[PDB]
Amino acid sequence: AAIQRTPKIQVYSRHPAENGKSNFLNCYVSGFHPSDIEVDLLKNGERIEKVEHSDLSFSKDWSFYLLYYTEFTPTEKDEYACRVNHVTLSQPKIVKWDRD
Amino acid sequence: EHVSFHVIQIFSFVNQSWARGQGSGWLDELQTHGWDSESGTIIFLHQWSKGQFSNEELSDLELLFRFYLFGLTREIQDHASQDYSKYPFEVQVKAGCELHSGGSPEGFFQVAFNGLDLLSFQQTTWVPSPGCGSLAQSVCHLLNHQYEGVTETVYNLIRSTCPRFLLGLLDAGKMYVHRQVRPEAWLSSGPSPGPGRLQLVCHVSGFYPKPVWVMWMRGEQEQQGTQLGDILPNANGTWYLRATLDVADGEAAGLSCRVKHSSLEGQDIILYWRGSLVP
Numbered sequence A: 001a002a003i004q005r006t007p008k009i010q011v012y013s014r015h016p017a018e019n020g021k022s023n024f025l026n027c028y029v030s031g032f033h034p035s036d037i038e039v040d041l042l043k044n045g046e047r048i049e050k051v052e053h054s055d056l057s058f059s060k061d062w063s064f065y066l067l068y069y070t071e072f073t074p075t076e077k078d079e080y081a082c083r084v085n086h087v088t089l090s091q092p093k094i095v096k097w098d099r100d
Numbered sequence B: 001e002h003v004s005f006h007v008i009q010i011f012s013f014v015n016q017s018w019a020r021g022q023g024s025g026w027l028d029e030l031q032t033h034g035w036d037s038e039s040g041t042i043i044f045l046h047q048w049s050k051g052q053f054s055n056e057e058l059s060d061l062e063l064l065f066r067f068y069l070f071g072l073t074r075e076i077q078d079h080a081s082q083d084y085s086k087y088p089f090e091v092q093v094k095a096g097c098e099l100h101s102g103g104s105p106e107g108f109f110q111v112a113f114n115g116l117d118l119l120s121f122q123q124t125t126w127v128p129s130p131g132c133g134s135l136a137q138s139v140c141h142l143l144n145h146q147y148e149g150v151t152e153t154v155y156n157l158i159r160s161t162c163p164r165f166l167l168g169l170l171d172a173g174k175m176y177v178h179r180q181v182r183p184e185a186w187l188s189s190g191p192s193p194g195p196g197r198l199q200l201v202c203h204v205s206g207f208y209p210k211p212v213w214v215m216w217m218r219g220e221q222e223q224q225g226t227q228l229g230d231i232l233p234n235a236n237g238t239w240y241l242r243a244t245l246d247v248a249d250g251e252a253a254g255l256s257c258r259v260k261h262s263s264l265e266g267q268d269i270i271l272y273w274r275g276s277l278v279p
């Protein structure tokens, strides 16, 4: 037997979206299994190269979680998103970052 | 309260030869160690990650982990190449200890196979998990009798070395584990829950320790409709929380967001919803 758990994607900024000031964009990908996943931070559709992520870790139910994060300067013209691809996803799932 | 230290290992066996392994060390939720798989060495993520252990001690623990990785991979790939159908599969090991209130230690060594509980090291014996039947019992039979010397080593690691190292780590990193970081809060308006209805959002980010209290309140009466989100991680060891509420447009004036945290040293954070009320 084997369990397969769909990843849960949450996109949020470290600081308020001060339009023009430096900030950090974080994509938290949690509760997935198996471990192999593809996470990308997208600015206006293209993949962001300078991206960093926590070391892989798992919860008590053995489901994995990761924290991808990048430094960014938000602007009214830009839209940001997090795109993850997992075996439990037929097509890649994209969650856009709302200003809020 | 209680404080734990864990070593986690994640192995992905892809085929009869390739098998990737990851590992890290965690004091509660703070990653203190990584594992460089090329050199097979411990990566000390903080200045105090040595935790009052000598370089000879830590060098020998490295050697032990290298040999454990070698043997574990060898035996699992030996048994698995017997049925190539299983590949790929995953094995997860969470080892370590927990100091209870009063100084009593309790050690863990838990193993999961493909995200399901495979077996545990309870007291002094390998206990198979209810669920995995044949594989759990077979791995337990191999461990309880054949691979001996591994059992005594697991016992002394999780019951003797782990608590000494945990207390050494707690003493070495006292200024970082006992730290208190003040949160920043801000209000915003989320998507409209309905026509005329209004969505208030309260963000509390950048706080450590993790426990926090966030509520939408009318003076002293806290609203019960407020939906508290998950406490999510930031980079550099802080946390984020979002508390939302939908309200009738017209009943939003007078509401505020209150945040209580240990770092606020009493005077809580209160943020009144203003909207488009201030000229």
Ligand SMILES: CCCCCCCCCCCCC/C=C/[C@@H](O)[C@@H](CO[C@@H]1O[C@H](CO)[C@@H](O[C@@H]2O[C@H](CO)[C@H](O)[C@H](O[C@]3(C(=O)O)C[C@H](O)[C@@H](NC(C)=O)[C@H]([C@H](O)[C@@H](CO)O[C@]4(C(=O)O)C[C@H](O)[C@@H](NC(C)=O)[C@H]([C@@H](O)[C@@H](O)CO)O4)O3)[C@H]2O)[C@H](O)[C@H]1O)NC(=O)CCCCCCCCCCCCCCCCC
Pocket (backbone or CB within 6 Å): B016, B068, B071, B072, B075, B076, B079, B080, B081, B082, B083, B084, B085, B086, B091, B111, B113, B118, B135, B138, B139, B142, B143, B147, B150, B154
């Ligand atoms: C600290 C240090 C260590 C501490 C702990 C250590 C580890 C702890 C315990 C570890 C696991 C123990 C539990 C095990 C339980 C078992 O029960 C075991 C086996 O169960 C039964 O076994 C049967 C084997 O027969 C299987 O039936 C086969 O299924 C297959 C479907 O894929 C085929 O249908 C095949 O048919 C044929 C066919 O056609 O291929 C017929 C052919 O006639 C025959 N050809 C012949 C005869 O020549 C051929 C033959 O069988 C194979 C195998 O013998 O021969 C070779 C060959 O020489 O050719 C061998 C060769 O090596 C190999 N090539 C290479 C490069 O390696 C080769 C190659 O060809 C294939 O790789 C690719 O093609 O095949 O098979 C069937 O036979 C059956 O499915 C299966 O249920 N179950 C398992 O889940 C395996 C373990 C994997 C999961 C376990 C991992 C997690 C557990 C551990 C937790 C970690 C430790 C805990 C604590 C940590 C430390 C304290």
Ligand SMILES: CCCCCCCCCCCCCCCCC(=O)OC[C@@H](O)CO
Pocket (backbone or CB within 6 Å): B007, B008, B009, B010, B021, B022, B023, B024, B025, B033, B034, B035, B042, B061, B065, B069, B095, B096, B157, B158, B161, B162, B165
């Ligand atoms: C193996 C069971 C361990 C039980 C507790 C051991 C006692 C703790 C003292 C160790 C000091 C530092 C060790 C943590 C860092 C090493 C590591 O991240 O290792 C993972 C690796 O091996 C997976 O490829």
Ligand SMILES: *[C@@H]1O[C@H](CO)[C@@H](O)[C@H](O)[C@H]1NC(C)=O
Pocket (backbone or CB within 6 Å): B014, B015, B018
């Ligand atoms: C075995 O796995 C590794 C990792 O995917 C790969 O490079 C290698 O070619 C694989 N062999 C196959 C698919 O036959």
Ligand SMILES: O=S(=O)([O-])CC[NH2+]C1CCCCC1
Pocket (backbone or CB within 6 Å): A054, A066, A067, B029, B030, B031, B208, B233, B234, B236, B237, B238
């Ligand atoms: O303050 S702290 O508890 O040390 C924060 C730990 N940061 C990790 C939390 C889980 C996701 C990866 C980053």
